[PDB]
Amino acid sequence: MLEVQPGLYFGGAAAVAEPDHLREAGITAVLTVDSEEPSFKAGPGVEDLWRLFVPALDKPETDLLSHLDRAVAFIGQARAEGRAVLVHSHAGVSRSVAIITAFLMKTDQLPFEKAYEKLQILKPEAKMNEGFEWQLKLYQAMGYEVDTSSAIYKQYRLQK
């Protein structure tokens, strides 16, 4: 695991491996970006845990742009309701980061590279593939928002 802001963390397998390790941090909401949606062990607090699953792989033609709005609102509402959010994936380097960045970006209208920086800082390991990169870049343009009934969107999706 690893923090990004007060009540913002991100990582991989060993992060959401054992949920008990979570109650340590004070996390009661978990956003997941992985090949398959996860299972958690019976444990205490696991049932009052928020969960949002973004279906994605680390491949460059994985549609993340269509989840950026929802993933950001989740982390947003999560915080507005109290809890520590954990954005994770098999290795919290691309998928995870990708969205972490996206949040940082929208929240304070930040230029892709500006927000992606603070992440490069915190984690040098940060290697977000090019697809998520231009998808995020594209987000800047759209106004850090995604108008599904927009020609840019409809085309983007058309291809992908």
- Distance separating alpha carbons of residues 49 and 62, to the nearest angstrom: 27
Q: Rounded to an integer, what distance in angstroms lies between the CA atom of residue 96 and that of residue 88? A: 5
Contacts of 77 (CB under 8 A, 6+ apart): none
Q: What's the sign of the alpha-carbon dihedral 127, 10, 38, 135?
A: negative
Contact 101, 128 (CB under 8 A): yes
Please choose, from the candidates 15, 27, 29, 91, the residue with its C-alpha nearest in 3D space to the C-alpha of residue 56. Answer: 91
CB 12, CB 90: distance < 8 Å: yes
Q: How does strand 27-34 pair with strand 50-55? A: parallel
Residue 55: burial class (beta carbons within 10 Å; 0-12, 13-18, 19+): middle
Neighbours of 150 (CB within 10 A): 12
Closest CA to 32 of 51, 45, 49: 51
- Three-state secondary-structure class, residue 41: coil
d(CA 47, CA 103): 25
The secondary element (H helix, E strand) that includes residue 22 is helix 20-25
**Which positions ≥6 away from 28 have C-beta within 8 Å?**
45, 48, 49, 50, 82, 83, 84
Residue 24, sorted as left (phi over 0), alpha (psi -120 to 50) or beta, turns out to be alpha
CA-CA distances (angstroms) from residue 143 to 21, 99, 117?
Answer: 37, 16, 20
Torsion of CA 57, 61, 67, 69, to 10 degrees: 130
CATH 3.20.20.70 fits 1-160, yes or no: no
Determination technique for this entry = X-ray
Give burial (CB, 10 Å; 0-12/13-18/19+) of 26.
Answer: exposed
For the record, the structure tokens of 127 come out as 């290697």
Enter the resolution in angstroms.
3.0
